[PDB]
Ligand SMILES: CC(=O)N[C@@H]1[C@@H](O[C@@H]2O[C@H](C(=O)O)[C@@H](O[C@@H]3O[C@H](CO)[C@H](OS(=O)(=O)O)[C@H](O[C@@H]4OC(C(=O)O)=C[C@H](O)[C@H]4O)[C@H]3NC(C)=O)[C@H](O)[C@H]2O)[C@@H](OS(=O)(=O)O)[C@@H](CO)O[C@H]1O
């Protein structure tokens with residue numbers, strides 16, 4: 134590949150990043166994308182340092198601060214993008230061009246050059262600047278001189294001599310992985326287009342292959358579809374999206390060329406569209422539970438990341454086989470159509486606009502999110518859906534950190550891995566509308582919490598500490614899931630709790646047992662902590678209403694149920710007092726992220742909780758949530774033994790779903806829950822249909838070689854579906870013995886015949 138091939142590649146990259154070849158004339162959405170492009174460009178030009186002998190490019194960005202160095206370069210690449218976009222205000226403007234070139238030249242001289250040692254965050258030097266400077270070189274290729282290309286290529290190569298590695302020499306260089314490997318390889322590939330370097334280009338393309346190989350530990354994609362970055366944090370929704378985005382752009386750039394990605398194992402990455410990404414996409418947003426510290430970012434939200442994922446999937450779909458293309462397009466049409474809260478075209482780039490318009494021109498229909506369960510045991514996450522809702526559970530364990538904080542972000546998120554119950558609904562803004570600026574970080578929905586105040590950054594940054602718990606894990610059979618978490622509290626309080634969730638097609642039954650702590654403080658369990666925005670949503674009870682006055686907590690009378698207008702129902706499954714608080718909360722994004730705005734946001738919440746008191750001995754809870762239930766259906770939840778608690782203690786927790794004729798259990802110790810026994814830790818769901826017993830089982834520690842069940846519903850003499858060895862114990866009950874060696878928390882499905 135020579136001059137013509139490199140020119141075609143550069144032209145293709147500019148087409149991709151500007152959308153210059155696909156602007157529809159007179160289209161209002163294209164006009165709006167151009168307007169947003171123009172306003173950002175004008176903002177940057179207004180901030181140019183025009184001073185003689187300047188020591189910065191922009192008056193509000195110091196080159197001595199590595200994040201502001203990155204923003205200097207991303208502003209220059211944005212300006213170059215605008216200069217290259219037909220109909221943009223600065224399109225082809227020579228005075229603007231000259232300012233961009235001078236900015237690149239001075240940022241090189243002053244700071245980012247082949248003689249400079251890294252100072253501060255490695256990512257700035259190796260990923261933030263190279264991607265932007267490479268883009269700028271390609272955008273401006275007809276305008277920069279050879280000597281300028283030499284200088285800027287030399288700078289990139291100094292900081293990133295090999296994109297398969299990361300960190301400056303003084304630190305010791307390690308293999309780059311996951312999103313970091315993609316981003317380093319992107320910067321080098323685009324730089325290799327500018328400099329016409331096939332050797333560097335080929336090595337960077339070859340570096341992509343590692344990121345879609347299945348892993349069983351560390352960072353990457355697991356066979357169950359989990360995605361981890363930073364070793365201990367579930368990360369599909371932020372770092373996973375960075376990986377998805379970069380590969381979409383590079384696969385598209387290189388396809389059909391001498392440099393095309395030809396590794397056949399890239400099918401694993403395509404499999405991850407539905408296996409990893411789609412289940413954690415909720416009406417256009419990535420689930421908070423899989424986006425780590427990014428929850429703290431006012432302008433990098435679940436909708437921003439979901440929109441990036443949609444762009445990427447649409448871009449990838451252009452190269453897929455027809456059935457897969459249409460499936461991915463239907464999925465995206467659904468995530469777009471259902472999201473009226475942050476419509477994808479508002480502030481969309483020209484390329485994003487074009488992909489969304491191309492989708493709408495295919496006529497591919499919107500696909501609904503499927504009901505039922507998607508489990509991710511390698512990352513301690515589960516997803517559950519029914520009509521009008523999606524539950525995302527956020528656990529932690531000896532494999533998965535309580536939380537990630539870092540770079541001044543999410544330092545207060547230490548309870549976000551304490552068994553959170555995110556109920557996503559048609560309230561699309563629930564977790565987005567200043568939730569993370571205003572919520573009570575000590576009363577997040579679903580958690581059990583020791584009320585001891587914890588410092589910011591408790592347990593350390595970067596997910597360095599994990600709870601030394603017994604297990605967290607899950608299974609599911611048909612419409613019912615069983616999820617368990619042994620919660621060990623952050624901050625060395627000694628909090629312990631056994632939390633389980635039994636999730637049907639409509640209702641979530643929440644059981645807690647064996648709760649105690651060493652701190653001497655009260656312990657709570659949060660039934661909900663629910664953003665009401667500026668609403669005054671009524672809390673209805675058997676007797677009338679509760680918590681009508683903000684700031685005065687009330688205890689629920691005897692009917693045991695409460696309905697929250699615009700949400701659904703809650704009901705107590707024991708005689709514990711339920712405390713109900715309507716409250717107004719305030720906070721700024723600066724309070725949760727060092728980069729957040731200082732603007733104070735004020736939001737109303739409904740907060741429902743159980744108080745286990747001081748010094749609980751084997752404290753417990755039992756409640757249920759019915760998203761979307763009317764007052765009439767909520768009033769009836771506790772009637773007819775629909776949700777039949779079997780056991781709830783330090784040995785096992787179990788419920789039977791009457792309508793679904795299905796029982797679910799978690800086992801902490803060897804023992805029995807009803808007529809089901811287990812020899813050790815287990816998640817089990819079972820249902821009898823006449824003379825056939827169906828079971829789902831997991832071994833949630835991920836470390837036991839065997840597990841034996843004592844079977845419910847009488848005796849069982851053959852195996853119809855699946856594996857396992859039938860036996861009989863000294864007492865005449867049938868047993869099922871499973872080899873669980875290496876199952877990594879995955880579910881075994883079994884069907885037996887009487
Ligand atoms: C300082 C240090 O040595 N810390 C490491 C830690 O490194 C940190 O983690 C990541 C990484 O990629 O591994 C890197 O996170 C990325 O940070 C940049 C800003 O620096 C962006 O954050 S933002 O400014 O809030 O935008 C970036 O956000 C993503 O950007 C983009 C994009 O630019 O294309 C798209 C997404 O929409 C947006 O989310 C952010 N990425 C994510 C996904 O949040 C940190 O800057 C770097 O400091 C880890 O290093 S590691 O390489 O071994 O993983 C950590 C692991 O234990 O070790 C610390 O020492």
Ligand code: NA
Pocket residue numbers: 362363364365366534595596597
């Ligand atoms: Na970590």
